């Protein structure tokens, strides 16, 4: 499965002047574009080598819409400030995520379009791609305007059309790096905390995509409550890292076995402390 | 390619 997403962040800055608009684009776990209105002459920039194949007309097309969003979000921020009876002295944030998910056939599997205000859900497009879910009555004012403007219809046309078509174009242009699955390099480590209890750590390294399952077991029984899992982190070279830890009493080290599940692995690997 | 329409909230 493959996906394309755009992440928008619009922040009001009363001290600094005019609101700032940032847009980043992703194909799965790979970032390929960025825009920041905070420049004298802002422009869309490539962030993945397979997108540099696109000519100048593509970069102008992206810049024109992101300049429109800069203007649009300045008003959305002003309007939302009114709905919540907020002071103009305060800094606020509108965030938005939208995109398409494809299946194994190059067809729209699921469409998305969600908005947030000050870090909380605001308005989201439903799975039917024709109706909205508003978080409160302020979001219902936005919903009224968006229904009158037929925003769900505009989104359905895009998610079913241009979103899947361009995601397919990107998948083909970056085929060797986007349609490749990097399996994790696994190893188990031992770290004593006391004389009679030691932490067993299971490592997953250099994997792509970020989607991974790490589970600790006691003779084939899940240790869900006792297992300490760290949030999947980027290595900085487009690969990911993750580890799972368990406080194991001295002597019962060979008893514990860890299980790794990833797209790049044909069979889920079972690992134990060696030697 | 991004969505090419925006509507004030």
């Amino acid at each position: 499965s493959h996906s394309m997403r755009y992440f928008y962040t619009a922040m009001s800055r009363p001290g600094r002047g005019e609101p700032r608009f940032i847009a980043v684009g992703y194909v799965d776990d790979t970032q390929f574009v960025r825009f920041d209105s905070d420049a004298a002459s802002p422009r869309t920039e490539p962030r993945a080598p397979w997108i540099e194949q696109e000519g100048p007309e593509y970069w102008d097309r992206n810049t024109q819409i992101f300049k429109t969003n800069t203007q649009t979000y300045r008003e959305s921020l002003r309007n939302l400030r009114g709905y919540y009876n907020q002071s103009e002295a305060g800094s606020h944030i509108i965030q938005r995520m939208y995109g398409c998910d494809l299946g194994p056939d190059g067809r729209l599997l699921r469409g998305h379009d969600q908005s947030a205000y000050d870090g909380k859900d605001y308005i989201a497009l439903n799975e039917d791609l024709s109706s909205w879910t508003a978080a409160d009555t302020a979001a219902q004012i936005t919903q009224r305007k968006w229904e009158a403007a037929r925003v769900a219809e505009q989104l359905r046309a895009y998610l079913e059309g241009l979103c899947v078509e361009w995601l397919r174009r990107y998948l083909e242009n970056g085929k060797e790096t986007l349609q490749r699955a990097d399996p994790p390099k696994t190893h188990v480590t031992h770290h004593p905390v006391s004389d009679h209890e030691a932490t067993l750590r299971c490592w997953a390294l250099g994997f792509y995509p970020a989607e991974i399952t790490l589970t600790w077991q006691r003779d084939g029984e899940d240790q869900t409550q006792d297992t300490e899992l760290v949030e999947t982190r980027p290595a900085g070279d487009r690969t990911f890292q993750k580890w799972a830890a368990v406080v194991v009493p001295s002597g019962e080290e060979q008893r514990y076995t860890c299980h790794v599940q990833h797209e790049g692995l044909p069979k889920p690997l079972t690992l134990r402390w060696e030697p | 390619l991004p969505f090419e329409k925006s509507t004030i909230m």
Partner: T-cell receptor
Amino acid sequence: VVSQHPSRVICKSGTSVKIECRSLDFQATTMFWYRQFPKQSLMLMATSNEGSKATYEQGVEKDKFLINHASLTLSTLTVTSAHPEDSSFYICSAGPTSGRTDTQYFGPGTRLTVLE
Amino acid sequence: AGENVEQHPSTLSVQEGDSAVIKCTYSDSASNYFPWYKQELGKRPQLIIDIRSNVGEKKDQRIAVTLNKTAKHFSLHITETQPEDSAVYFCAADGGAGSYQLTFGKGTKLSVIP
């Protein structure tokens, strides 16, 4: 809905006519100004942009038609030093969606008659 | 700027009760919004129907719109024509590069002889 004022104008040559275009129930970052001659077609003259300068179409005198995007609800068309050849039906349109143009709602039009 | 909308025919005469079809062609694939406007003499164009790139056909009473996105053309279908349908009809598309706008067709003067 979108409205216009005046709906009909009769003026002597040399006078300037200011035509308003208002979005009555939504905010518009863009408004479009058209000219309709006895030749039925909608000829786009200019695109009013908030708060940047207007985008004129090919074969449109910038100095004859002054477009100003006054606010998120009002755009004005000024026919400077009008002459009988400037007599036409001036109609505007606006819509709530910005970016790649979507549903447009037209004003009632302004009939301008310039007499010597 | 990179969008050209062609409306065929320029004029059309039909008998009250027969069907009328206006055909529009477009050039750009960024065109996803296809509105149809009806303009009576001395009056404003009114939106009567529209279609989007994800839909092949949309119907509303006697009015219908058809879209063929592969061949890049769309049609208005008026059935059981009434003399009140007599007006100038315009079609549009939202595609093309440069300045954002609806690219209109030149029009179709429809005449419904009672």
